[PDB]
Design a protein around this ligand. Structure first.
Ligand SMILES: CCCCCCCCCCCCCCCCCC(=O)OC[C@H](CO[C@@H]1O[C@H](CO[C@H]2O[C@H](CO)[C@H](O)[C@H](O)[C@H]2O)[C@H](O)[C@H](O)[C@H]1O)OC(=O)CCCCCCCCCCCCCCCCC
Ligand code: CLA
Ligand code: CLA
Ligand code: CLA
Ligand code: CLA
Ligand SMILES: CC(C)=CCC/C(C)=C/CC/C(C)=C/CC/C(C)=C/CC/C(C)=C/CC/C(C)=C/CC/C(C)=C/CC/C(C)=C/CC/C(C)=C/CC1=CC(=O)C(C)=C(C)C1=O
Ligand SMILES: CCCCCCCCCCCCCCCC(=O)OC[C@H](COP(=O)(O)OC[C@@H](O)CO)OC(=O)CCCCCCCCCCCCCCC
Ligand SMILES: CCCCCCCCCCCCCCCC(=O)OC[C@H](COP(=O)(O)OC[C@@H](O)CO)OC(=O)CCCCCCCCCCCCCCC
Ligand SMILES: CCCCCCCCCCCCCCCC(=O)OC[C@H](COP(=O)(O)OC[C@@H](O)CO)OC(=O)CCCCCCCCCCCCCCC
Ligand SMILES: CC1=C(/C=C/C(C)=C/C=C/C(C)=C/C=C/C=C(C)/C=C/C=C(C)/C=C/C2=C(C)CCCC2(C)C)C(C)(C)CCC1
Ligand SMILES: CC1=C(/C=C/C(C)=C/C=C/C(C)=C/C=C/C=C(C)/C=C/C=C(C)/C=C/C2=C(C)CCCC2(C)C)C(C)(C)CCC1
Ligand SMILES: CCCCCCCCCCCCCCCCCCCC
Ligand SMILES: [Cl-]
Ligand SMILES: [Cl-]
Ligand SMILES: [Fe+3]
Lengths: 333, 33, 32, 36, 254, 33, 35, 28, 51, 340, 81, 47, 62, 37
């Protein structure tokens, strides 16, 4: 059958890159988002992100370098409305209002969601256990948080994270002004997740490199002591555990490789999950702890803490973000 | 003394003392009031 | 854009010199 | 008499690719500051 | 074969070629000093030390030649502003040409030591193997260091036989190279007292000479020779780097 | 088994003040301005 | 002042009380050590 | 001219991706 | 609304993780390798090499 | 000999190894940790900063800090017996003496810990790469807590030891140094986040390429630490990532070294850039952009927006974050957009 | 293997332990309490009491201005209360 | 700052040089087993 | 290896490779010098830091 | 002469010398009693 040949090739394990059914969506959507991103980063004209007819330049050809360049998010006048090309009277209007942003982020989110599914899929075709895709769900959820979830709760794709280095920082700063995310325990767990992951990654790598079993001379790389697919382990887990158990105390060390590797997966993934959830729940304006004026003296004078110093800085971001867009005294959008 | 009893009472001591700290956060010093 | 008149040569050499270093080393490996 | 302390040098294809990537990415990051 | 980041470990048991590579490094550093000063001379504007001094013009070596006495150019100006003064050979230009010639001489030296790496001097007489007696080498070099150090404070900075060093009023209004008398009181550990700098080099130079002599005569304790691997040249690189970063921090701070 | 060891000292320099500090922090919840 | 003795009192009592419950089991440890 | 340099570097990285994937050293 | 919106997004996200977890495991249990790879019949070792 | 007798006892196999490095490590670490705990519970910041900062004053775990000494102390070591406290424990606390106490005893503790990793590595028989990797934490601590304030006017502008105090530090560095724009911090982000990534992805890969060595559905039991065979399949994990991502590890030794390299390299890069910020040698601007924007009021990028935010931070937080400056900004000088 | 101390399990299980520690843990805890309830913690560490941050008509923060007579400056602040 | 790393690195290379191409292949598990020796790593201190 | 005129002259300076004094040798003396140097460095530092203030020592440009 | 800060300097010097002395005194004593076999 001809459809069975197609299905046999879509699902082949002999392809240099695995395609698969998730890939039948992934490949076109990612290619579309990638091509449009490259073109808009170089060439897009200014975009009126805040919907106040004050366009924001973001591309290289319009006076940006790699650091200041962005694909600018679509207009605040658009809000959450869907805005493909065909909804616009002309390419010129589409570029002015932020069209490439929606095109890119929606194709990308679709493409990365299917990337996750592709990971389950090839793993199933290979006889593997299936949960690598669960780990990749932590950055995917984070991407979902800042491109889709946070716009939904706020009410405009214009509050999505710009596709750009400086645009990203403009997102972090305005976010802290509005939601106090440093004082939110879900971002703190994210910090604990990436710092801890960095630490543990550093740790595991130094401990295994430390226990490598002598197989080479000095005039060559220790790496040539491992050959792709040997059945013998290349380091000495017992020596590494002997070392690290003495560094702290023995029961604070791992003697089970599977138990240690599970810990390596779980610590950053969980912490990133929570920090995705922190962006996703601050989207609905459940904000970080507010301790402003929390400590008071017996007369009633405010006794500042460091929280009140954080507030003075938050205030200064607040009254300067979107400096022309507010006509009324409360920041409700 | 069975450890599972020691585990439960210690944690129960932990939960009580933490609950007292969260309690104070709404009353007295640092309560905003 | 009024940029540094030496940024072009700086970037070009910053790429070129270590790249050629690596390329030199790789190709003389492959001939052994 | 030849010096006995000589040794051949080696950089394999993977190290070449990792190194070219390190330099290209560093250039891509630093060129903006160079151009200022 | 050797990885790229290990190419230079072929000098580890080759003292002749290690000397050659150290000579080439010294040639390149002195080559830089002459280059940098030539470049600065080709761009520095001397016509006003009040509002456009050297430190407004991005001059980096020029203040170090001035610090130790060089103040004038073969073309007639002085960094203080005085006209009709004669620097003689040791002008800014003369300092640079000396470093260029030094670099060339070191360059030729490195070529010789590289070709003639296999000198009987580097061999151990009873085993036949390349060997460097690093504890005695340290005594010799430490003795050399105290001598030059003593010599630098006693003759150069006193003015006894040299120019002195830059000194000035507390508001940097009227500075000049001047002979400086050692300060032997406690105020010689005041960083802002030039006399302390003279005293330091005389005293430390002497201490350096004594200690160098000690390290030339007394062999190291066996227990300290094993703990510090004193037969392994890499232990010297290690403590040497440590001493260099201790120095780097101090000069950054001052 | 021995009773006092290097561990003994280590657990008591952390633990003695911990319980002491938790006591002090306990009473702080009842401070009214 | 009086506050210091108010605070140290339990700890002194606790230490003494622990000293009394552990004393026979400690002097055997030290005796075992002296060898 | 800065644009041309930024785009040139990006393009060399893409070309590198291509060679690193399809003309990698085959693990045996 | 905030309280209800935020909680149910958390519950929803974790149940999607739950779906990915138990789905893949169900698929691997049915195929017979949810406990790991048989050393004596490793599938990749019988496929040809990508290059 | 007595030295060989003391070496025998220091290197005894106990529950908590001591070693020669312990004579430095334990008292300094214990005093750093004890000093932080002491101050966050009892010690104010009313005379140094005008801040409350202890449990005893009303602060919670997120707002307690051992705060930095007032700007007027300069870089004083602030020793207890030194000239500022003159041996008065009460006044030393009130003057910020716990800050230097913690930072200095902490600095020496970190030396002791790195020596500890050396000491244990040599006794046990392994290479010392764990201590090498710990250089990055030390480099970070030295640059941020010692060098950075040594560059500035005083220990005051070092980070105060506290959760929210650290957050303020982060925000000061955005408003004043524009630290996000610095490529040395960017390289740190990429090594921290790239480390998290390598940690997560290598753990998942091993757990999802395991061989079947037991019959239990919880697969942990199927490992014995004394076993000789690899517990997961490098061949299968290679094919998977080759076909998913394009490239895959094929050398287990290079893979684990790379896990050392990346986050260690990145922390060292962020230290370098902090060293630059000690001197206010910031990546604050791009000169080309400022020249365009000054001549063209219709030019607006995300870079120029961030600078408006930095200027708002500085004017709105400086009167209380830098109280030794007696700053008084009348309302009309404060930068602010419409309405807010 | 095992290093040689008594397992913590057998210790917090043994009756002798809780004979000793049902007194000591509460003693220190009560000790800590009294350290704050007597007001000693205020004077040892110099932390102001809720009525000792300002004088009855002052909003200026008592900031240390001088490095070397600082000890005396803090005490001139406490006197104005 | 950068040279302090060089000191650590070259320091380690000096003190640990006998194993910098990899730990001993024949290293006994008893060496790293707690309590087996009264002095860590010393083989002259068995119980 | 290669004998040269300057080689033969320098010969004895590179001829005690591995020679050590027995046992602890002069180590205790090295310690006393190490201790004095440390106390000395600590004085220099505290004078620059203005933790140690001595008469006639005014740490300033003046 | 001996300024107040110079008096403090010796206060600190002796304190540290006492601390390291008591430390090494007690550590040598423990090491003599509980030797190894
Ligand atoms: C790898 C790391 C391994 C681990 C190591 C851990 C070690 C921990 C212990 C280290 C302790 C360092 C203490 C530094 C204290 C200090 O510095 O204290 C600073 C003092 C200088 O004091 C400062 O002096 C300044 C300048 O004053 C001068 O100028 C003023 C205005 O003109 C006046 O004229 C004044 O009279 C005059 O003295 C200001 O007055 C400041 O208030 C005052 O703090 O220098 C000094 O003590 C000494 C200066 C030279 C010594 C080197 C310093 C260390 C490296 C610093 C690099 C930073 C550069 C960036
Ligand atoms: C022949 C000798 C000689 C002389 C007279 C000079 C003279 C000069 N050089 Mg040149 N130079 C020389 C050789 C010489 N150089 C060589 C061989 C090289 C190559 C390495 C250089 C490289 C060089 C550079 C890179 C620079 C100069 C510069 C200078 C000028 C400033 C010097 C200065 O401030 O030094 C200050 C020197 C020191 C502070 C030395 C400190 C040494 C530390 C403390 C050693 C510690 C270890 C020691 C053993 C301690 C133990 C002993 C102790 C107990 C006694 C000056 C005109 C500067 C200039 O302006 O150029 C245009 C400059 O930047 N030179
Ligand atoms: C490993 C142990 C250790 C280390 C490294 C440190 C290190 C430090 N402590 Mg800490 N400390 C320790 C243990 C330690 N402490 C212990 C156990 C305690 C509790 C008792 C304390 C209590 C403590 C306090 C209360 C303070 C410090 C402080 C300090 C700092 C100042 C030290 C100083 O000036 O010493 C100077 C003294 C020496 C270096 C001794 C030198 C000894 C050698 C052998 C020479 C001997 C000379 C001889 C006696 C002759 C004297 C001179 C005569 C000829 C006239 C420094 C960061 C201070 C601080 O952080 O302030 C902010 C501070 O206030 N420590
Ligand atoms: C994606 C977000 C992101 C990421 C990944 C990073 C990542 C990083 N930032 Mg950046 N930063 C960000 C956003 C981010 N930043 C933003 C938006 C800002 C505002 C502009 C800042 C502002 C900022 C500042 C102000 C600083 C950083 C620094 C850092 C580095 C900190 C590394 C570290 O572990 O320090 C942690 C500290 C250490 C590892 C020191 C050693 C600590 C010892 C080992 C602890 C031992 C504790 C002991 C056992 C007892 C504890 C007990 C107690 C808990 C009870 C790292 C490269 C720092 C830096 O560059 O330093 C060089 C720094 O100072 N960032
Ligand atoms: C005086 C200082 C000094 C000296 C003589 C050495 C010498 C050596 N080091 Mg060490 N090292 C030092 C400082 C020093 N190091 C410092 C400060 C660091 C931290 C940055 C290191 C970090 C370090 C590591 C991690 C390693 C060595 C290794 C080595 C050995 C082989 C190096 C080689 O073949 O490089 C060949 C280098 C190249 C082919 C190209 C390097 C190009 C660099 C990355 C950038 C260009 C620099 C530029 C040309 C000049 C800068 C000048 C100035 C800033 C100094 C060699 C014995 C290696 C070793 O142990 O081997 C067994 C090794 O792995 N070193
Ligand atoms: C001057 C004077 C008096 C001197 C006298 C000194 C003296 C003799 C004192 C004796 C008494 C004494 C010791 C008192 C001490 C007081 C005291 C307690 C001081 C300590 C103070 C202090 C701050 C201690 C901190 C302790 C500390 C750092 C605890 C760490 C807790 C912690 C974070 C643990 C995490 C560890 C962890 C989760 C590890 C797993 C993560 C991971 C990736 C591991 C990687 C890994 C693990 C393996 O397992 C193996 C196998 C491999 C491959 C591998 O990848
Ligand atoms: C049961 C609770 C689950 C909590 C959420 C999941 C935690 C682990 C998810 C990590 C996925 C990593 C990517 C692949 C990782 C991977 O491949 O895992 C593999 C590893 C081993 O798998 P096995 O096949 O042996 O076991 C899984 C099933 O087959 C059951 O046998 O899985 C586990 O051990 C799961 C442990 C469940 C118990 C988890 C409890 C831990 C969380 C505790 C709560 C923390 C809250 C923190 C609050 C601040
Ligand atoms: C669905 C298809 C998706 C395709 C995605 C794109 C794939 C491209 C991935 C990188 C390919 C290039 C790798 C070169 C280098 C290369 O070929 O690596 C090959 C190397 C193979 O390792 P081995 O273990 O075989 O090496 C063994 C010995 O040769 C070591 O000496 O892989 C790694 O080392 C993993 C770590 C590199 C991780 C690189 C991450 C790349 C992220 C990209 C960052 C750049 C951003 C640029 C933005 C403009
Ligand atoms: C949170 C931190 C995570 C650590 C892992 C938790 C283990 C969780 C775990 O698996 O526990 C299990 C373990 C079992 O103890 P047992 O001695 O009862 O077990 C022995 C049995 O096998 C019977 O022989 O309990 C402990 O190790 C508690 C240790 C606390 C003792 C602390 C003493 C003070 C140490 C001082 C600091 C030393 C650090 C050195 C560098 C400064
Ligand atoms: C890039 C860069 C860098 C680096 C730099 C360098 C490293 C440089 C080098 C430089 C150099 C390294 C220079 C040198 C030069 C040299 C020269 C210029 C020489 C000359 C010589 C001569 C001319 C000689 C001659 C002669 C002869 C040979 C024979 C004898 C006689 C005579 C004299 C004739 C850094 C880090 C800063 C960072 C930034 C950027
Ligand atoms: C300063 C100083 C000193 C020292 C002292 C000390 C050393 C102290 C210590 C102290 C201490 C040592 C303290 C402790 C404390 C502790 C605490 C206060 C704790 C708490 C805890 C908690 C609260 C918990 C929590 C939690 C967690 C974390 C986990 C789970 C969850 C929960 C929530 C349960 C001296 C006098 C020498 C000198 C002078 C200065
Ligand atoms: C009324 C205020 C009480 C807040 C809740 C205190 C108990 C919380 C326990 C958490 C564990
Ligand atoms: Cl904005
Ligand atoms: Cl509005
Ligand atoms: Fe691993």
């Amino acid at each position: 059958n001809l459809w069975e040949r197609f299905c046999n090739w879509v699902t082949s394990t002999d392809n240099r890159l695995y395609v698969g059914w998730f890939g039948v969506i992934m490949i076109p959507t990612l290619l579309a988002a990638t091509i449009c991103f490259v073109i808009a980063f170089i060439a897009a004209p200014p975009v009126d992100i805040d919907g106040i007819r004050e366009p924001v330049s973001g591309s290289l050809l319009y006076g940006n370098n790699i650091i200041t360049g962005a694909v600018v998010p679509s207009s605040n006048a658009i809000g959450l409305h869907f805005y493909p090309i065909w909804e616009a009277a002309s390419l010129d209007e589409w570029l002015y209002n932020g069209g490439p942003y929606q095109l890119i982020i929606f194709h990308f989110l679709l493409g990365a969601s299917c990337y996750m599914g592709r990971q389950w899929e090839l793993s199933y075709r290979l006889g593997m256990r299936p949960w690598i895709c669960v780990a990749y769900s932590a950055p995917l959820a984070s991407a979902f948080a800042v491109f889709l979830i946070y716009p939904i709760g706020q009410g405009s794709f214009s509050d999505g994270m710009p596709l750009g280095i400086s645009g990203t920082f403009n997102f972090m700063i305005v976010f802290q002004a509005e939601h106090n995310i440093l004082m939110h325990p879900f971002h703190q767990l994210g910090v604990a997740g990436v710092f801890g992951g960095a630490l543990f990654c550093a740790m595991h790598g130094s401990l295994v490199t430390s226990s490598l079993i002598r197989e080479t001379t000095e005039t060559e790389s220790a790496n040539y002591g491992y050959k792709f697919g040997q059945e013998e382990e290349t380091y000495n887990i017992v020596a590494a555990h002997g070392y690290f158990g003495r560094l702290i105390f023995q029961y604070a060390s791992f003697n089970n490789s599977r138990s240690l590797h599970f810990f390596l997966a779980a610590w950053p993934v969980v912490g990133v999950w929570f920090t995705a959830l922190g962006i996703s729940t601050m989207a609905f304006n459940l904000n970080g702890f507010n301790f402003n004026h929390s400590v008071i003296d017996a007369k009633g004078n405010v006794i500042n803490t460091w929280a009140d110093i954080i507030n003075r800085a938050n205030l200064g971001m607040e009254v300067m973000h979107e400096r022309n867009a507010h006509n009324f005294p409360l920041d409700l959008a | 003394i069975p450890l599972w009893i020691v585990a439960t009472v210690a944690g129960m001591g932990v939960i009580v003392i933490v609950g007292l700290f969260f309690y104070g956060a709404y009353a007295g010093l640092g309560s905003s009031l | 854009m009024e940029v540094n008149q030496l940024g072009l040569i700086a970037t070009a050499l910053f790429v070129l010199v270590p790249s050629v270093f690596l390329i030199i080393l790789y190709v003389q490996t492959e001939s052994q | 008499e030849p010096n006995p302390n000589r040794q051949p040098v080696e950089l394999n294809r993977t190290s070449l690719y990792l190194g070219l990537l390190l330099i290209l990415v560093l250039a891509l990051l630093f060129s903006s500051y160079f151009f200022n | 074969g050797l990885p790229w980041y290990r190419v230079h470990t072929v000098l580890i048991n080759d003292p002749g070629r290690l000397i050659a590579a150290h000579l080439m490094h010294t040639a390149l550093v002195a080559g830089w000093a002459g280059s940098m000063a030539l470049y600065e001379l080709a761009t520095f504007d001397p016509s006003d030390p009040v509002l456009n001094p050297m430190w407004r013009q991005g001059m980096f070596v020029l203040p170090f030649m001035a610090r130790l006495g060089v103040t004038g150019s073969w073309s007639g100006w002085s960094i203080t502003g005085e006209t009709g003064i004669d620097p003689g050979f040791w002008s800014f230009e003369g300092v640079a040409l000396a470093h260029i010639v030094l670099s060339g001489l070191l360059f030729l030296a490195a070529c010789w030591h590289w070709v003639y790496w296999d000198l009987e001097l580097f061999r151990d007489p009873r085993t036949g193997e390349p060997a460097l007696d690093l504890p005695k080498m340290f005594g010799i070099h430490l003795f050399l260091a105290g001598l030059l150090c003593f010599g630098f404070g006693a003759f150069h900075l006193t003015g006894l036989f040299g120019p002195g060093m830059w000194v000035s009023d507390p508001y940097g209004l009227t500075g000049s190279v001047q002979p400086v008398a050692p300060e032997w009181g406690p105020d010689g550990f005041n960083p802002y007292n030039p006399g302390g700098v003279v005293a330091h080099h005389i005293a430390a130079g002497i201490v350096g000479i004594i200690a160098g002599l000690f390290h030339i005569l007394v062999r190291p304790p066996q227990r300290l020779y094993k703990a510090l691997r004193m037969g392994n040249i890499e232990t010297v690189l290690s403590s040497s780097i440590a001493a260099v970063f201790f120095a780097a921090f101090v000069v950054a701070g001052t | 088994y021995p009773i006092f060891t290097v561990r003994w000292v280590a657990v008591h320099t952390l633990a003695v003040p911990t319980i002491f500090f938790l006591g002090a922090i306990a009473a702080m919840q009842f401070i009214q301005r | 002042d009086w506050r210091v003795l108010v605070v140290l009192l339990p700890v002194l009592l606790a230490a003494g009380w622990a000293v009394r419950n552990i004393l026979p089991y400690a002097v055997k440890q030290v005796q075992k050590l002296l060898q | 001219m800065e644009t041309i340099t930024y785009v040139f570097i990006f393009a060399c990285i893409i070309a590198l991706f291509f060679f690193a994937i399809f003309f990698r050293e085959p693990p045996r | 609304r905030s309280w209800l919106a935020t909680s149910h997004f958390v519950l929803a996200f974790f149940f999607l993780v739950g779906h990915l977890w138990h789905a893949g495991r169900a698929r691997a249990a049915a195929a017979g390798f949810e406990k790991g790879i048989d050393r004596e019949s490793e599938p990749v070792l019988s496929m040809p090499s990508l290059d | 000999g007595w030295f060989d007798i003391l070496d025998d006892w220091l290197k005894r196999d106990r529950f908590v190894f001591v070693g020669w490095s312990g004579i430095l490590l334990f008292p300094c670490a214990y005093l750093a940790l004890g000093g932080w705990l002491t101050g966050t519970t009892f010690v104010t910041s009313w005379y140094t900063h005008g801040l409350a900062s202890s449990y005893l004053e009303g602060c919670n775990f997120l707002t307690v800090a051992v705060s930095t000494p007032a700007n007027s102390m300069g870089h004083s070591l602030l020793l207890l017996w030194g000239p500022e406290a003159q041996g008065d424990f009460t006044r030393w606390c009130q003057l910020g003496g716990l800050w230097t106490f913690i930072a200095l005893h902490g600095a020496f503790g970190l030396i002791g810990f790195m020596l500890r990793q050396f000491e244990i590595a040599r006794l046990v028989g392994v290479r010392p790469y764990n201590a090498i990797a710990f250089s990055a934490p030390i480099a970070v601590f030295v640059s941020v807590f010692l060098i950075y304030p040594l560059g500035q006017s005083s220990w005051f502008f070092a980070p105060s030891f506290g959760v929210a105090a650290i957050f303020r530090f982060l925000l000061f560095f955005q408003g004043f140094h524009n630290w996000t724009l610095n490529p040395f911090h960017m390289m740190g982000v990429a090594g921290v986040l790239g480390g998290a990534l390598l940690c997560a992805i290598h753990g998942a890969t091993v757990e999802n390429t395991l061989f079947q060595d037991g019959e239990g559905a919880s697969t942990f039991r199927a490992f014995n630490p004394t076993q000789a065979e690899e517990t997961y399949s490098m061949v299968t994990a290679n094919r998977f990532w080759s076909q998913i991502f394009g490239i895959a590890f094929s050398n287990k030794r290079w893979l684990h070294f790379f896990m050392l390299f990346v986050p260690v390299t990145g922390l060292w890069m962020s230290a370098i850039g902090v060293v630059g910020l000690a001197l206010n040698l910031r990546s604050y601007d791009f000169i080309s952009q400022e020249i365009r924007a000054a001549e063209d009021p219709e030019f607006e990028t995300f870079y120029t927006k961030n600078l408006l935010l930095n200027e708002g931070i500085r004017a709105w937080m400086a009167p209380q974050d830098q109280p030794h400056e007696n700053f008084v900004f009348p309302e009309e000088v404060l930068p602010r957009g419409n309405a807010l | 293997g095992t290093t040689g101390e008594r397992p913590f399990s057998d210790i917090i299980t043994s009756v002798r332990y809780w004979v000793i520690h049902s007194i000591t843990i509460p003693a220190l805890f009560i000790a800590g309490w009294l350290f704050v309830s007597t007001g000693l913690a205020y004077d040892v560490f110099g932390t102001p009491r809720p009525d000792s941050y300002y004088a009855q008509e002052q909003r200026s923060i008592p900031l240390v201005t001088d490095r070397f007579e600082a000890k005396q400056q803090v005490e001139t602040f406490l006197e104005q209360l | 700052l950068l040279f302090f790393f060089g000191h650590i690195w070259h320091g380690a290379r000096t003190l640990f040089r006998d194993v910098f191409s990899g730990i001993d292949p024949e290293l006994s598990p008893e060496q790293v087993e707690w309590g087996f020796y009264q002095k860590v790593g010393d083989v002259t201190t068995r119980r | 290896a290669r004998r040269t005129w300057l080689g033969d002259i320098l010969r004895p300076l590179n001829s005690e490779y591995g020679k050590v004094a027995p046992g602890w040798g002069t180590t205790p003396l090295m310690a006393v010098f190490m201790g004095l140097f440390l106390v000395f460095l600590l004085i220099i530092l505290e004078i620059y830091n203005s933790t140690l203030i001595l008469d006639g020592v005014n740490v300033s440009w003046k | 002469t001996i300024t107040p800060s110079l008096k403090g300097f010796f206060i600190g010097l002796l304190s540290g010398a006492v601390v390291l002395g008591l430390t090494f005194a007690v550590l040598i004593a423990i090491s003599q009693i509980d030797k190894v076999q």
